[PDB]
Amino acid sequence: SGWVTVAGLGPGREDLVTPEVTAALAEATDIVGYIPYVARIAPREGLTLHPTDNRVELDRATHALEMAAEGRRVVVVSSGDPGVFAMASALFEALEAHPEHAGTEIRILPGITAMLAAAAAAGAPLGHDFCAINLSDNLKPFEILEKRLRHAARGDFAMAFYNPRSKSRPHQFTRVLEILREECEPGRLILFARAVTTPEQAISVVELRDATPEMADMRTVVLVGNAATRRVGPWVYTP
């Protein structure tokens, strides 16, 4: 029989793809995924490719499940970790909606997630209790974002922001900063980490009083230290 595997490809560099993930890629008959993820995979004999847009999902996933039934071995690929604001959740949601697909074999395969690759490049800003928050979740009303931000601020968590800029919400990030400037000392360290692990990696470290929305974009993860996070030489860490 066939299967569905949801594999994390890591933040970009090929030497971060686990050998686990590489093996499943060698077994697959089909690769489903967002255009530029699919493009990271060397084309080869017997491997049908199904690129897609970053939206939809659900049928993206139901489709993967329908292909398991015909004996196709399907890898749905994600950047970073598939369980971090990625395709793992859509699959199960698509699974709950279709009881006649329960019983297809499913495997979730972890990856180096963006925040930790960023952390590693900067030093150790996530070395204490930390949280991760999606800033382009359009199914999530803004009142919920604010409740996460404020409770992370007050609980003195280090933060990682995924999808800082939506342009669906043309700013929102502009708003996001305000809340931090309310809830945190102005010295709070802010890391703008863009295209981490790629040839165009650039990391900027800035205090909260000087943080502008323009400093983050589509290819950035924003790390926010807790109260004690500081510098040593070019590094950042949390004592």
Q: Choose which of 78, 79, 113, 163 interacts with a second copy (CB under 8 A).
A: 113
- Pick out residues in 42-71 that bind a second copy (CB under 8 A): none
Is 159 one of the annotated binding-site residues? Answer: no
47 or 195: whose CB is closer to ligand SAH?
195
219 or 230: whose CB is closer to a second copy?
230
Q: Does 95 bind a second copy (CB under 8 A)?
A: yes
The one-character DSSP state at 100 is G
**SS3 of residue 239 by DSSP:** coil
22 or 212: whose CB is closer to a second copy?
22
Is 137 one of the annotated binding-site residues? Answer: no
The one-character DSSP state at 157 is -
Task: Return the H-helix or E-strand segment holding 180.
Answer: helix 173-183
Q: Is 110 exposed, middle or buried (0-12, 13-18, 19+ CB in 10 A)?
A: middle
State the nearest-atom distance from the C-beta of 199 to a second copy, in Å.
15
The answer to whether residues 173 and 216 touch, using CB atoms and an 8 Å cutoff, is yes
Q: How far apart are CA 199 and CA 217, in angstroms?
A: 17
DSSP 83-148: TSSSHHHHHHHHHHT-GGGBTB-EEEE----HHHHHHHHHEETTSSSEEEEES--TTS-HHHHHHH
Residues that bind ligand SAH in the complex, under the rule CB under 6 A? 11-12, 78-81, 84-86, 113-114, 162-164, 193-198, 218-221
Which residue ranges are tagged as binding site for S-adenosyl-L-homocysteine?
11, 81, 113-114, 163, 196, 218, 220
The residue ranges that bind a second copy (CB under 8 A) are 10, 13-20, 23, 81-86, 88-89, 91-93, 95-96, 102-103, 106, 108-113, 116-117, 119-121, 123-134, 137, 139-140, 144, 147-152, 154-157, 232-233, 235, 237-239
